[PDB]
Every structure is written in structure tokens, then in C-alpha cells.
């Protein structure tokens, strides 16, 4: 309805690009910050029409600007040339706020999927703190669900609506390219991942009753969301997701397809310097990787699904919006 504000523990001092962005763009967070609470009222939600989304999404656009030049940017007919060099990279916490004379309510129902009359409301100056974490097909360092794994899409039976599942224990993933040199793999551990999907398709099984929960891999479509893409320290992961999004629930009981040993998944990735980029249709090329071991360790804390007897989900994403929205669904601006 108006125009938000960033707070962060941004560093003046710290070169770390989120860092050096916020200091210009954020102003300092509030020690105690005041909530209210506010149990009767009950007011509408929407997340998936939230102008803090765009108001986002604008703010992280112009960090990747100012933070990961590209050497070379291609869109429409130009080519853009500029010096890209490797930079430290690693997301920070951003609080959204409302402006004098407008107010942010927060959902307080632990339950609540995104959509429509919430109970228990508050009002808060500020958002949570929200790692702006670009990433297709998992959703990583968000903030869990506090009760139950939630499904979450704009319309479940339009299927070309993403859905997104917020999980309420995270999964940890580990990538790594050790010290050819584009190669390298992620770790899961297989009985998390075999737990979180029972229950995810437990869930999934809720809204569509009859039918028997498949999960498959990515059918087709660029490589940055038939992978599960992500940026770590810079450079840029595409690990197969194959042995991930590869299961059946059948009957109360998940069966994993994938396969794995020693009871872990290994995704192979690749490190990739030709971008099909989240910002705007185009490509972006990158410089070749920096040296020595580039390792991320992150909890999954959502997924991004798309649906095609049997209903059968294959991970999605493409659109950064969604990711905002995963962490956002709970607010909105007001008065
Ligand atoms: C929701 N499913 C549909 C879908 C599928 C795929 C995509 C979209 C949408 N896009 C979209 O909505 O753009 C927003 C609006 C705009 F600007 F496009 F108008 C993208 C269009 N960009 C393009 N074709 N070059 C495209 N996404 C990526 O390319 C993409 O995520 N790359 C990527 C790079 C680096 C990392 Cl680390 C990463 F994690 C991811
Ligand atoms: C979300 O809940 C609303 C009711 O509050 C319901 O109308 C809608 O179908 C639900 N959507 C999903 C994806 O569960
Ligand atoms: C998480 O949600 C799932 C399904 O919604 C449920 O089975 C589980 O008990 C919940 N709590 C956890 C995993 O702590
Ligand atoms: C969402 O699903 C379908 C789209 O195929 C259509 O009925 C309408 O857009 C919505 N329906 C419901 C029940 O919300
Ligand atoms: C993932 O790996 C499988 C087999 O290892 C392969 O068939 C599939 O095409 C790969 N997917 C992508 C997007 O590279
Ligand atoms: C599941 O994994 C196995 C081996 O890891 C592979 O042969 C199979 O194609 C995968 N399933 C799908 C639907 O791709
Ligand atoms: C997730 O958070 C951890 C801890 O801050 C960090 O080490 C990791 O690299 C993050 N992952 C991504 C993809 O940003």
C-alpha cells in the first residue's frame, strides 16, 4: 500500500556484499521491537498477491546489481560488459518496514496456509529477519513451520500454480567442490530426507485423498530449475536432484525410489558460469571458479512443487517471488 524500508545487522566493516548493500540501502534494527497482540480481530491474508513480495524482490534485484556483476549480460539484442570480479558472498538477515503512519500485521495463527481469514493477529513495525536466498526446487535457511508441515499454492487445483511446502523440521544438504573443477556433489542424509517426504505426502495426501503421492524428478525446462540451482560463495551449484524428487506414498507409507549408499544421497553438481538469469529474461556469464574448497552447509526448510489413480509432484521454481512469499506469507501492510 506504501513504500517499506529495510533494517539489518548489516557491517559497515564487513566486505561481504549483503553487508557492504544494506549498510547504503538499510537502516540499523531495533533492540526490542514492539508487538501487539490483538486475538480477536481476525483479518484477511493473501500472500499470494503482496506488494511486500515486489517490494522485495525490487530490493534484491538491485543488491545482485550492485553485488554479483556479471562479465557479460545478454538480454534482448545487447550484451553489457563489465568487470565481474570474485567477491565474499553469503546472505544476511533483512527486516521489512513499515513507514510512519503504517503498520505491518503479522499472522499469528501457527496453522495458517496463506490464504484467507487469519485469528490471532498483531502488529509489528517489522518483519522477521528474512536471508534473501536465491535458489530453485529447495528452499534453503528459511524459517520453519512451528506446528505442521504446510502446503501452500495460489489455487491446488489449477497445477500450474507452484505449490510451496514449509516443513517444520529441516533437512540438511551439504555442498561442496573440493580442493575437474566445475565438479561437485551435495550430501543428504537419507533417513531425513525418507521421514520429511512420509510426511509431506501425508500432508499432500490430505488434499487429494483418493489418489497415490508420487515424486519425480524435473520434467524439462532450463537447467537452473530442472536442478536444484543455487549460488554458494559466489559461484553458481546446479546438483541433480534425480535421486531427491524420486518416491512413492502408497498407502500411509513412503516408499524412496532414488537411490543412495551408506544411507546418504549424493547429488552431482556442476559449477556454472552461463546463467539463465531470476532478474529478467536473459543470460549472464561469470568468471571461472575461485580456488580451493567451496562448501555451503544449509538446511532445507521448503520445497517448490509443481503437479502434473495418481497425483505426481516434480520440484519447481523459476520464480523468485515464490521464495519471498515463503517467508513473507504472514504479513501485510495496513492503514
Ligand atoms: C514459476 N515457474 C515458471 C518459471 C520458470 C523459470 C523461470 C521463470 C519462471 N523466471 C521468472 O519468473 O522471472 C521472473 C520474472 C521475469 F523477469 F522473468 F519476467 C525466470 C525468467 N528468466 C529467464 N528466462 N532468463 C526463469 N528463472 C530462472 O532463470 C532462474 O531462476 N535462474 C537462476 C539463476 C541463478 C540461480 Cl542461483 C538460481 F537459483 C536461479
Ligand atoms: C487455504 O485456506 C483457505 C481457507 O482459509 C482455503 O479456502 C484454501 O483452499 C486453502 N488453500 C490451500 C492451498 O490449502
Ligand atoms: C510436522 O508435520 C507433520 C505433518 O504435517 C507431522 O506428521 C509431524 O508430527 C509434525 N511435527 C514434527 C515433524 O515435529
Ligand atoms: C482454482 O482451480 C481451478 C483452475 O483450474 C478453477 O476452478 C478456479 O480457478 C479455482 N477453483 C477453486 C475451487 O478455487
Ligand atoms: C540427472 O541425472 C540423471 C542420471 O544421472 C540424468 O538422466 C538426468 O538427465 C540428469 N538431469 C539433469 C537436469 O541433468
Ligand atoms: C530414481 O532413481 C533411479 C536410480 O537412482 C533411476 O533409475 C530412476 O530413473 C529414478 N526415477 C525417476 C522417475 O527418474
Ligand atoms: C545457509 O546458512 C549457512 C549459515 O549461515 C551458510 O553457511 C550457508 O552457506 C547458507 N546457504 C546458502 C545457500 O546461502
Same mark, same amino acid.
Given at each position: 500500500?506504501?513504500?517499506?524500508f529495510?533494517?539489518?545487522?548489516?557491517?559497515?566493516?564487513?566486505?561481504?556484499?549483503?553487508?557492504?548493500?544494506?549498510?547504503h540501502?538499510?537502516?540499523?534494527?531495533?533492540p526490542?521491537?514492539?508487538?501487539?497482540?490483538l486475538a480477536?480481530?481476525?483479518?484477511?491474508?493473501?500472500?499470494w498477491?503482496?506488494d511486500?513480495?515486489?517490494?522485495?524482490?525490487?530490493?534484491?534485484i538491485?543488491?545482485?546489481?550492485?553485488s554479483l556483476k556479471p562479465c557479460?549480460?545478454?538480454?534482448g539484442?545487447s550484451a553489457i560488459?563489465?568487470?565481474?570480479?570474485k567477491?565474499?558472498?553469503?546472505?544476511?538477515?533483512?527486516?521489512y518496514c513499515?513507514?510512519?503512519?503504517?503498520?505491518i500485521?503479522?499472522?499469528?495463527?501457527?496453522?495458517?496456509n496463506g490464504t484467507?481469514?487469519? &485469528?490471532?493477529?498483531?502488529?509489528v513495525?517489522?518483519?522477521?529477519?528474512?536471508?534473501?536466498?536465491?535458489?530453485?526446487?529447495?528452499?534453503?535457511?528459511?524459517?520453519?513451520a512451528?506446528?505442521?508441515?504446510?502446503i +501452500?499454492?495460489?489455487?491446488?487445483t489449477n497445477?500450474?500454480?507452484?505449490?510451496?511446502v514449509?516443513?517444520?523440521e529441516?533437512?540438511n544438504?551439504?555442498?561442496?567442490?573440493?580442493?575437474?573443477? &566445475?565438479q561437485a556433489?551435495?550430501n543428504?542424509?537419507?533417513?531425513?530426507?525418507?521421514?520429511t517426504?512420509?510426511?509431506?505426502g501425508?500432508?499432500?495426501?490430505?488434499?487429494?485423498?483418493?489418489?497415490?503421492?508420487?515424486?519425480?524428478?524435473?520434467?524439462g525446462?532450463?537447467?537452473?530449475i530442472?536442478?536444484?540451482?543455487?549460488?554458494? +560463495?559466489?559461484?553458481?551449484?546446479?546438483?541433480?536432484?534425480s535421486?531427491?524428487?524420486?518416491?512413492?506414498?502408497?498407502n500411509?507409507?513412503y516408499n524412496?525410489?532414488g +537411490?543412495?549408499?551408506?544411507g546418504?544421497?549424493?547429488?552431482?553438481?556442476?559449477?556454472?558460469?552461463?546463467?539463465?538469469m531470476?532478474?529478467?529474461?536473459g +543470460?549472464?556469464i561469470?568468471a571461472?571458479?575461485?580456488?580451493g574448497e567451496?562448501?555451503?552447509?544449509?538446511?532445507?526448510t521448503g520445497?517448490?512443487?509443481?503437479?502434473?489413480?495418481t497425483?505426481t509432484f516434480?520440484?519447481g521454481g523459476?520464480?523468485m517471488?515464490?521464495?519471498?512469499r515463503?517467508?513473507l506469507?504472514?504479513?501485510?501492510?495496513?492503514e
Amino acid at each position: 500500500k506504501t513504500t517499506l524500508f529495510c533494517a539489518s545487522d548489516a557491517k559497515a566493516y564487513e566486505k561481504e556484499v549483503h553487508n557492504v548493500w544494506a549498510t547504503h540501502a538499510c537502516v540499523p534494527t531495533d533492540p526490542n521491537p514492539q508487538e501487539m497482540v490483538l486475538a480477536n480481530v481476525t483479518e484477511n491474508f493473501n500472500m499470494w498477491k503482496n506488494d511486500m513480495v515486489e517490494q522485495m524482490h525490487e530490493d534484491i534485484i538491485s543488491l545482485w546489481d550492485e553485488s554479483l556483476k556479471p562479465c557479460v549480460k545478454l538480454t534482448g539484442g545487447s550484451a553489457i560488459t563489465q568487470a565481474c570480479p570474485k567477491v565474499s558472498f553469503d546472505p544476511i538477515p533483512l527486516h521489512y518496514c513499515a513507514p510512519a503512519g503504517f503498520a505491518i500485521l503479522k499472522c499469528n495463527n501457527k496453522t495458517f496456509n496463506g490464504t484467507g481469514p487469519c &485469528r490471532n493477529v498483531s502488529t509489528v513495525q517489522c518483519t522477521h529477519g528474512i536471508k534473501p536466498v536465491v535458489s530453485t526446487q529447495l528452499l534453503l535457511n528459511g524459517s520453519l513451520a512451528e506446528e505442521e508441515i504446510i502446503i +501452500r499454492s495460489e489455487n491446488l487445483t489449477n497445477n500450474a500454480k507452484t505449490i510451496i511446502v514449509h516443513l517444520n523440521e529441516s533437512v540438511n544438504i551439504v555442498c561442496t567442490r573440493p580442493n575437474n573443477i &566445475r565438479q561437485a556433489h551435495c550430501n543428504i542424509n537419507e533417513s531425513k530426507w525418507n521421514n520429511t517426504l512420509q510426511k509431506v505426502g501425508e500432508e499432500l495426501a490430505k488434499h487429494f485423498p483418493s489418489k497415490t503421492i508420487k515424486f519425480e524428478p524435473s520434467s524439462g525446462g532450463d537447467l537452473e530449475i530442472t536442478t536444484h540451482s543455487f549460488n554458494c +560463495r559466489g559461484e553458481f551449484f546446479y546438483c541433480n536432484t534425480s535421486d531427491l524428487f524420486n518416491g512413492t506414498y502408497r498407502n500411509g507409507t513412503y516408499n524412496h525410489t532414488g +537411490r543412495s549408499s551408506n544411507g546418504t544421497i549424493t547429488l552431482q553438481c556442476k559449477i556454472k558460469q552461463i546463467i539463465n538469469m531470476w532478474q529478467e529474461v536473459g +543470460r549472464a556469464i561469470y568468471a571461472p571458479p575461485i580456488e580451493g574448497e567451496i562448501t555451503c552447509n544449509s538446511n532445507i526448510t521448503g520445497l517448490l512443487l509443481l503437479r502434473d489413480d495418481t497425483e505426481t509432484f516434480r520440484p519447481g521454481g523459476g520464480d523468485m517471488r515464490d521464495n519471498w512469499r515463503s517467508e513473507l506469507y504472514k504479513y501485510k501492510v495496513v492503514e
